[PDB]
C-alpha positions as a Python dict, from the first residue, in 0.01 Angstrom:
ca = {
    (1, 'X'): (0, 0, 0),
    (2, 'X'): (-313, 149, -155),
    (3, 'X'): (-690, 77, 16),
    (4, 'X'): (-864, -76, 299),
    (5, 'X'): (-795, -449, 366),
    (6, 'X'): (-932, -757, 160),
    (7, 'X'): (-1209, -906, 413),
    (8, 'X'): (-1156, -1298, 489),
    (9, 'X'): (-1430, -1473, 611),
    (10, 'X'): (-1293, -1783, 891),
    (11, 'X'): (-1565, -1999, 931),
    (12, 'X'): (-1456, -2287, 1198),
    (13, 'X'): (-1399, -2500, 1516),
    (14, 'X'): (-1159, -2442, 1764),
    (15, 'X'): (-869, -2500, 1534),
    (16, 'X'): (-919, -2132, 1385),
    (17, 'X'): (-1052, -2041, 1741),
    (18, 'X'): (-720, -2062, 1855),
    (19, 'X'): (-798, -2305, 2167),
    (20, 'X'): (-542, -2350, 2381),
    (21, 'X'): (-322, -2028, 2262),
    (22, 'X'): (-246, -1638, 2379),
    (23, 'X'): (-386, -1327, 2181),
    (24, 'X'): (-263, -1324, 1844),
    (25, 'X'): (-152, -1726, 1793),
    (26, 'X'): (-437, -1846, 1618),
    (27, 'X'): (-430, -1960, 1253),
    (28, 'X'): (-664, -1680, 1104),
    (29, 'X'): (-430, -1419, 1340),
    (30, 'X'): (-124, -1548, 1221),
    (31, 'X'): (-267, -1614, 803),
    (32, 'X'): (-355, -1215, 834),
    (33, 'X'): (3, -1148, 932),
    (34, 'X'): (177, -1394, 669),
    (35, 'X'): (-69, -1264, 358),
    (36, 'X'): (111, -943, 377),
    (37, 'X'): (424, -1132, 230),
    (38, 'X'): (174, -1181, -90),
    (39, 'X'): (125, -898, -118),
    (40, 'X'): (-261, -917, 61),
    (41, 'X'): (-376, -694, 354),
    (42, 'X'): (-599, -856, 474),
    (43, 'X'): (-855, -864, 764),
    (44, 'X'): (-919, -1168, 845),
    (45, 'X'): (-1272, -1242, 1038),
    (46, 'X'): (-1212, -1509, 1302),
    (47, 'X'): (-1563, -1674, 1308),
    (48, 'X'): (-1379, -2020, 1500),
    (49, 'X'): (-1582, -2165, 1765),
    (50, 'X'): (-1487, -2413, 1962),
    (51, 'X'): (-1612, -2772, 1969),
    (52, 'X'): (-1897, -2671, 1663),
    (53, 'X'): (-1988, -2975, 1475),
    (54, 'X'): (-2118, -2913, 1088),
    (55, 'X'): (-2440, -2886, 1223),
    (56, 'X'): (-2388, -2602, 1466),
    (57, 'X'): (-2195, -2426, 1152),
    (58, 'X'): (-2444, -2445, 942),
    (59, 'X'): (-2726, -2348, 1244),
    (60, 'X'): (-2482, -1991, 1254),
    (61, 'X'): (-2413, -1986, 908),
    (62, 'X'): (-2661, -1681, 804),
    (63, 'X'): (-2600, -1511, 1153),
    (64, 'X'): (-2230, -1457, 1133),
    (65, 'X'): (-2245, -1344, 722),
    (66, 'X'): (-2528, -1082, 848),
    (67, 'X'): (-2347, -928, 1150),
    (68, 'X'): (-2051, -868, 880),
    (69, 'X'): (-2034, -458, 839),
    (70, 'X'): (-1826, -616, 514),
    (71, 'X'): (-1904, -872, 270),
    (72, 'X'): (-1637, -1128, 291),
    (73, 'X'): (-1439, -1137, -59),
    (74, 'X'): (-1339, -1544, 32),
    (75, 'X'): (-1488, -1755, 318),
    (76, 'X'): (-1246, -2029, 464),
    (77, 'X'): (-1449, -2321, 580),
    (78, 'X'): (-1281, -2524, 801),
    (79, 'X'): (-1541, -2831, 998),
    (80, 'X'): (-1607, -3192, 1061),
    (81, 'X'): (-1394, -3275, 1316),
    (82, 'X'): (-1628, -3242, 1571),
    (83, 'X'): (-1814, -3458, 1381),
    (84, 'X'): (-1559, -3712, 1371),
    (85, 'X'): (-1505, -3679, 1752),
    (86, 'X'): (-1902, -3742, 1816),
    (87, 'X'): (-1853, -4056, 1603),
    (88, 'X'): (-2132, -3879, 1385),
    (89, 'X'): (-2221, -3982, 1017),
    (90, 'X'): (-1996, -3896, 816),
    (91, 'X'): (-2327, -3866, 531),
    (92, 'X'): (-2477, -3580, 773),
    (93, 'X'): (-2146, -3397, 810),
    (94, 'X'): (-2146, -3362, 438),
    (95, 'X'): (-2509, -3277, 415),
    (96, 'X'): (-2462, -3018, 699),
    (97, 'X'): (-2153, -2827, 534),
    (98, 'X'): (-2375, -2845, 216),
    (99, 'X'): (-2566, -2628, 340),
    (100, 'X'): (-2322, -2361, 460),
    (101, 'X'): (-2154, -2380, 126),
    (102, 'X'): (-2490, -2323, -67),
    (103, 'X'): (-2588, -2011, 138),
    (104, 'X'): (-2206, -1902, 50),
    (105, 'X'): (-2241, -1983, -312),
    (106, 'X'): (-2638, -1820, -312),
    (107, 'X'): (-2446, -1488, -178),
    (108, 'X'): (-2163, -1552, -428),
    (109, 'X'): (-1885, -1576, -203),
    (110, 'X'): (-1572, -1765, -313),
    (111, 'X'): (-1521, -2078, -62),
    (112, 'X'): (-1153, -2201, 17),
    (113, 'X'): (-1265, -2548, 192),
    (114, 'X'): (-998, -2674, 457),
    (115, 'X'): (-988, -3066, 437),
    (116, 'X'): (-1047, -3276, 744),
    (117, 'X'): (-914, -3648, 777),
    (118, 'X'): (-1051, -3928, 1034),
    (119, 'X'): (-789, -4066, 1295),
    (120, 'X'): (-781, -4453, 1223),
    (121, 'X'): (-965, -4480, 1564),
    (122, 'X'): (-1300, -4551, 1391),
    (123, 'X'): (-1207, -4770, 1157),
    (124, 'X'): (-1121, -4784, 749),
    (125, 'X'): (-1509, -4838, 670),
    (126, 'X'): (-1606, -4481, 845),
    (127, 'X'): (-1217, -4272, 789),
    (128, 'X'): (-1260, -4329, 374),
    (129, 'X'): (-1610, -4236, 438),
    (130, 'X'): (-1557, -3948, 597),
    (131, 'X'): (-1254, -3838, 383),
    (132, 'X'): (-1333, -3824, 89),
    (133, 'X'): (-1689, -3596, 192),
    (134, 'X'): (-1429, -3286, 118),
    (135, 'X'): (-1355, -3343, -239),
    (136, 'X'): (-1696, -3444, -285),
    (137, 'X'): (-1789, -3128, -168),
    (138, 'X'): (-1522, -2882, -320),
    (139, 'X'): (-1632, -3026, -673),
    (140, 'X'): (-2004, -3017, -604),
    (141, 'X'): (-1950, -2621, -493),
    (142, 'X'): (-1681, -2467, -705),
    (143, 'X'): (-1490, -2444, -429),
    (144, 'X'): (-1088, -2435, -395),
    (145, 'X'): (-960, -2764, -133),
    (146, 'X'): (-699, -2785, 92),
    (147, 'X'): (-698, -3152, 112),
    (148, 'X'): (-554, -3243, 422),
    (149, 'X'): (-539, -2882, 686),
    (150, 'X'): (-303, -3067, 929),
    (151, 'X'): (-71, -3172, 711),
    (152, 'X'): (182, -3009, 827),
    (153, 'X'): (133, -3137, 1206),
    (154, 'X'): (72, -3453, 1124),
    (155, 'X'): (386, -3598, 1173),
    (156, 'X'): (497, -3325, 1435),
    (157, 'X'): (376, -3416, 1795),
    (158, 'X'): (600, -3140, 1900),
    (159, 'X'): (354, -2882, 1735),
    (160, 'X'): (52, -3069, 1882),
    (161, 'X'): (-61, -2937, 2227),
    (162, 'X'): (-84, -3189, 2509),
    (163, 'X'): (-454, -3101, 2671),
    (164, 'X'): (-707, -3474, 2620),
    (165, 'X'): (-535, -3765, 2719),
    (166, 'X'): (-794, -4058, 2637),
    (167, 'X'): (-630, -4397, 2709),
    (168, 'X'): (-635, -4653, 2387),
    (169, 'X'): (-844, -5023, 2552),
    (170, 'X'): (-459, -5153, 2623),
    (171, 'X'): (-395, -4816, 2787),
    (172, 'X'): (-727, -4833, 3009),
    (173, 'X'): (-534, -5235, 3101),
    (174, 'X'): (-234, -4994, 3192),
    (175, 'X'): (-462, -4778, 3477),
    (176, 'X'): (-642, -5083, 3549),
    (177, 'X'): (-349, -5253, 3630),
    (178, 'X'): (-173, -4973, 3854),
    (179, 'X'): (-505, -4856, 4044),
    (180, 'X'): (-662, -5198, 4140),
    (181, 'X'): (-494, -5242, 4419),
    (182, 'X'): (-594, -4900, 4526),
    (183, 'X'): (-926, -4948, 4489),
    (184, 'X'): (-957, -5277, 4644),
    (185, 'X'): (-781, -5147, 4970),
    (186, 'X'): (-1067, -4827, 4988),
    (187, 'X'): (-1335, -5103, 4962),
    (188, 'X'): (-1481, -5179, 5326),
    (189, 'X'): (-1410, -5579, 5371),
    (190, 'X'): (-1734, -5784, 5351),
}
């Protein structure tokens, strides 16, 4: 093919950061590769950082789009669930990644926005809060919406990597209930 590569701005947490993987496994690493079947070259800017919340994002936001040598042609934004994993309001999230998709739109860069959904951990009063901030947002900024990014994991556990293992409160019963007696033999008697 004709011309140098369309530029792809990927603007996210560790789940474009490729945390956890080898060179070259990532999701923007592996998108680049898979555009070429439509027809795309592209070069795809892998802006992930690990463990940023919508606040860090948007605190980077203006650094990362000035340190570009190219101005990206789309900008994938993909963040919140670091938000969701600080227990954080889901009101700020969506005020913080308003602000990264206004300095986008200011600089007229189309925005692909990857949809995040809360674990039911928190509860149904915060997870349809914080749900439905992402189609609040794609229609408030012109912006194209994956709804739901994991999708396609989210019935897969196979294609999840095993790293955090927080016990559930039954599960914490389950290490209470295997360690006590450990614990009460290293205790000095009284």
């Amino acid at each position: 093919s004709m011309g140098e590569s369309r530029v792809i701005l990927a603007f996210g947490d560790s789940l474009f950061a490729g945390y956890g993987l080898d060179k070259g496994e990532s999701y923007p690493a592996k998108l680049e590769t898979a555009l070429r079947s439509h027809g795309i070259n592209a070069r795809i800017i892998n802006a992930g950082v690990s463990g940023d919340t919508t606040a860090a994002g948007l605190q980077r936001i203006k650094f990362v789009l000035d340190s570009q040598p190219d101005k990206p042609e789309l900008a994938i934004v993909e963040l919140g669930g670091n938000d969701l994993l600080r227990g954080l309001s889901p009101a700020e999230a969506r005020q913080n990644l308003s602000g990264i998709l206004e300095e986008l739109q200011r600089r007229k860069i189309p925005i692909l926005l990857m949809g995040m959904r809360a674990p039911p951990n928190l509860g149904a009063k915060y997870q349809r809060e914080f749900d439905g901030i992402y189609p609040y947002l794609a229609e408030k900024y012109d912006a194209k919406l994956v709804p739901f990014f994991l999708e396609a994991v989210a019935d897969r556990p196979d294609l999840i990597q095993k790293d955090h293992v927080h016990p559930t409160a039954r599960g914490v019963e389950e290490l209470v209930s295997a360690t006590s007696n450990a614990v009460a033999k290293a205790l000095p008697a009284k």
